[PDB]
Amino acid sequence: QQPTGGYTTLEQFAFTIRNDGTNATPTQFLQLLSWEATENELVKKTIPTPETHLPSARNVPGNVYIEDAITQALFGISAQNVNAHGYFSRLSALALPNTSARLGLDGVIYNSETINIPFYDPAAVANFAATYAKLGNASTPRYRADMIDIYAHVGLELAGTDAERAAGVMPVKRAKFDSWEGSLISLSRDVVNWKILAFLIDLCSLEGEALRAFKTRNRDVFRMMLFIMSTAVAANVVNRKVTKRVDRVLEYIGVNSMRTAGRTATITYDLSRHEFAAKFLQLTFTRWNA
Amino acid sequence: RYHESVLEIADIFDQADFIQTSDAVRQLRALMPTLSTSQIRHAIERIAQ
Helix, strand or coil: CCCCCCCCCEEEEECCCCCCCCCCCCHHHHHHCEEEEEECCCCCCCCCCCCCCCCCCCCCCCCCCCCCHHHHHHCCCCCCCCCCCCHHHHHHHHHCCCCCCEEEEECCCCCCCCCCCCCCHHHHHHHHHHHHHHHHHCCCCCCCCCHHHHHHHHHHHHHCCCCCCCCCCCCCCCEEECCCCCCCHHHHHHHHCCHHHHHHHHHCCCCCCCHHHHHHHHHHHHHHHHHHHHHHHCCCCEEEECCEEEEEEEECCCCCCCCCCCCCCCCCCCCCCHHHHHHHHHHHHHHHCC | CCCCCCCCCCCCCCCCCCCCCCCCHHHHHHHHHCCCCHHHHHHHHHHHC
């Protein structure tokens, strides 16, 4: 039960990976990417403000594993059956003015006195679940996130050089890099492992001056969050040969292709998974921008 | 004064997308008893068999 000052930036919540084997904080891994531009453009539009009304808080019996689940779904490897209310209806509760369900540090949801498990501030998580509960809507017909517009954003957000391309437009860039066999997936799982909440609870709380200081601090943790995430969608991915070294080449880094089969070089969204990621991005982005 | 050597071709070209196999073959063909065209028709005819 510890306060803040910034939830991340606090030991336990570090974000690392694997560079064919080492670690390196993501900023360090994304600086190893290259973009051939290619016709088109990705004129960002406007994320449709969230569907305000969130799922009804249903007690339900159990310990909703949320950090783990939200991510298993976003960049997992196949989350079988995502969006099921069950986990979110419950997560909704946390978004009330007074409850017992404490959000366990490790990434869970409890009752009364969780006991032992040092949960989060009750306030921070309050503002958190406020929005990320709506996330348990993406399933329903009238709330779908409407994904191809949203991926426009993911892009000038991920690639697109600062400022220059941070001006609404840019060419789809086909991204490639020196990989290491089964690179994309191995990398994704280092991320499935990651502690997300720490990132959001902090993202949905931090005042305003501190919020910007924070945006810069995780500029990269965040870009990395969705690089591995966007490749799930990006069409073809193949390996470009070079000179003994191999270079993973990614179809188009920004143009979600709404593909649902199961590649090998990467993750793969079932259809309903897009329904979920599309929605998750709508929220993080509406939020990232303020 | 010789050190008659194999010089595995690859140690000459930088764009090794053509280069293949190796010095290991000279080792082998050095053993094959020089064959005639009629001779090969046979070696091949019997492998395929």
